[PDB]
Design a protein around this nucleic acid. Structure first.
Lengths: 432, 432
RNA sequence: AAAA
RNA sequence: AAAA
């Protein structure tokens, strides 16, 4: 899949020039037609600031004005309708109207929008044009794109190309080359932050205390998050630290994560004030880092949901999941931890023993004496510490016990064991 | 250390305006004075494109013209002269001049310059202003700065703030807010790139192939680097995968890395052709990703050189190096590996026995079953594999042997063991 | 609890 | 080349 993302400012103010790109040439006010002709992408995203809009009767009319002006300009330059348009919240005082709010709303808004567009299945070839962009929208869009692509790179091959034309200068420019400014294979970077404090999801920009306190207390989302926070941090730590059983057992509820992000986004939306008379937009609520973390968390769950299975969870599944999630010494750590349990399983099966509901301590033949659960042992043994894991082997008639034992031996956390694992992993994440 | 980095284009064409920032107010053509007043940095860096240059016979004439116009503008506005100016290789055709080369040279040049300015001891508070920047020079400078700060964060606390003013509309705007667009605690990111093939240090942009193959063959750098490559990759993998003994034994020669980077940078500099009459700059050689990797590699060595000591290496020294360098399950694996060696050493010291130069396999009491060195066992056990490591206890009179064994027990790779480990770690870095 |  |  080939994805073209372009950063635009006041696109209607661009002068007619010509562009050079992939040994093609082109005449007009935009790079987008020659980029589409050479790169031939499956999908195009246009990112710009709402600060070009002029219809101040309401928020939906402002977006409608900006969107009509993009669609009119696409027909003019001949670029086709097969496009997504991200209308980011911009800032500044202009003659045609006034736009106020946190500038970082643009990062959170674009991140949210891109998280619903970037495919969560298959390889990605991503092309980014900064040519026409505002400094601030371009930098925040670059950053949001890189953050989600780093997460998609845990499951899939992700390549990224950046473009920028030579500087335009009126009255002297004959033609602009579209330069390559980046060519990267994106490294896998799983989410590596805890969920923050409840002061950090939605922040007052210009809303008084009575309205904010009442609004913050009205949100189901912050109530339900208080309750799941430690479970979600447990899951984040499972990709970061190499804990394949914790990855499956703490796998988040995607419907639930959707409704948290929906409720925060539409509360941010409802707090935007549009004054038709003064031609002022005030974004009275600002997004905080916690909204960004939730968006990334949902995206990471969509990227990895292919690996989630129906319990019970076998050694063979834990190998299979681990091969997709983990690399380097992390992956070898997991294979050493799983291998020790698999070896004992092969020996039991060889002698027609099939233990059920047995603590991992007993299965491995450890001392009943060492039942304290340390951070050190939970983290250094892929989360499979002998005092928190229970083992069950299915009974079968073995023929090749060395190939068969692994799929027939199931592991789960004990109820008590899970809660101690959750505490250790949550705590290790927060002291990163 | 507080560090201010600024991104400038045609700084002289900016209009007088009012800036708001940190409760202060400033009237001027530049953000720089109000940024310096409010942030009070220890050091300022200005990054701009050489494509502003006017009457050039030579590279030195180009750079003098540009530097002199920056110093005129600094004096004219608030700012002082405790300033580095990075004059970056830019691109495009302008009234006064024509600049041809790889646009990505700006990234490698700014990365090289910042690697010689950003301090490599102590915490970093870094401020980045993009308001006056060219789109392409701004992204490449942001990226370069983030790449180096990620390495610095392995050893020190690094915080990063980015700023961008509201958009300027000519003749209309009056006051401009300087907005915050990023606040970040920079995550530790050790270098995760292998050194590339020998075609990726310097590439012809505009050079005859006879001239290029002759230059290549004349470079001591590429000859020496052919010999050192696997060793340098072993050391990169040691921080990445958690191998504290390999980190000490393969610690690279800083004087030689300096020499390789200066030869590549000097060669790129001399391949730059200036035609006085047609006012044309051609950078005949482009920097490749391998110049980037050598710069990051020298920086990560400077950041970590305070941890290095001479042989021998105690279990106590390896705990402390691991405590500074490693986190999560990587550190807890180091501690378990080292702890098993210490435990066994206490048992020997209790019996008054002080064995020397003994294979780790024999020291731990391993049998004969396997003597092969698997990537799995090297990477999963913090590079302390049983067949490649030799243990020496240096005899003392034990009183509290459980407190004393760590000081007096030393580990070393065997000469044959070091080679296999290098091959395994080098290959792991290249696959992942 | 031979690589727990 | 502060809405190429």
């Amino acid at each position: 899949m080939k994805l073209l993302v372009v950063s635009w400012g006041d696109f209607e103010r661009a002068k007619e020039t010509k562009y050079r790109f992939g040994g093609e040439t082109s005449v007009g006010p935009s790079t987008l037609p020659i980029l589409q002709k050479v790169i031939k992408p499956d999908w195009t995203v246009i990112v710009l600031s709402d600060t070009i809009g002029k219809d101040f009767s309401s928020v939906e009319t402002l977006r409608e004005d900006v969107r009509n002006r993009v669609m009119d300009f696409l027909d003019r330059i001949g670029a086709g309708r097969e496009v997504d348009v991200i209308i980011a919240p911009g800032i500044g005082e202009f003659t045609h109207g006034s736009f106020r709010g946190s500038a970082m709303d643009a990062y959170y808004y674009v991140l949210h929008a891109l998280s619903e567009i970037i495919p969560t299945k298959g390889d990605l070839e991503v092309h980014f044009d900064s040519t026409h962009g505002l400094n601030y929208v371009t930098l925040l869009t670059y950053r949001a794109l890189k953050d989600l692509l780093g997460i998609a790179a845990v499951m899939n091959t992700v390549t990224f190309y950046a473009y920028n034309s030579d500087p335009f200068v009126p009255k002297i420019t004959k033609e602009l080359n579209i330069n390559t400014i980046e060519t990267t294979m994106v490294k896998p970077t799983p989410l590596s932050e805890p969920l923050p404090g409840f002061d950090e999801y939605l922040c007052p920009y210009s809303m008084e205390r009575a309205e904010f306190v009442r609004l913050k207390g009205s949100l189901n989302t912050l109530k339900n998050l208080r309750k799941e926070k430690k479970k979600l941090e447990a899951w984040i730590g499972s990709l970061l630290f190499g804990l394949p059983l914790l990855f499956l057992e703490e796998f988040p509820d995607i419907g639930r994560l959707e409704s948290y992000i929906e409720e925060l986004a539409e509360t941010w939306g409802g707090a935007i004030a549009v004054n038709a008379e003064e031609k002022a937009v005030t974004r009275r609520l600002a997004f905080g880092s916690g909204f960004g973390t939730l968006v990334k968390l949902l995206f990471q769950a969509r990227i990895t949901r292919g690996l989630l299975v129906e319990e019970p969870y076998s050694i063979e599944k834990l190998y299979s999941v681990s091969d997709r999630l983990f690399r380097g010494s992390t992956l070898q750590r997991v294979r050493v931890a799983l291998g020790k349990i698999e070896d004992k399983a092969i020996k039991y099966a060889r002698k027609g023993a099939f233990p059920r509901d047995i603590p991992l301590r007993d299965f491995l033949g450890f001392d009943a004496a060492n039942r304290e659960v340390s951070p050190r042992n939970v983290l250094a043994h892929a989360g499979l510490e002998a005092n928190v894991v229970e083992v069950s082997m299915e009974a079968w008639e073995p023929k090749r016990p060395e190939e068969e034992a692994g799929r027939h031996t199931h592991l789960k956390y004990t109820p008590v064991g899970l809660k101690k694992v959750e505490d250790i992993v949550s705590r290790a994440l927060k002291e990163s």
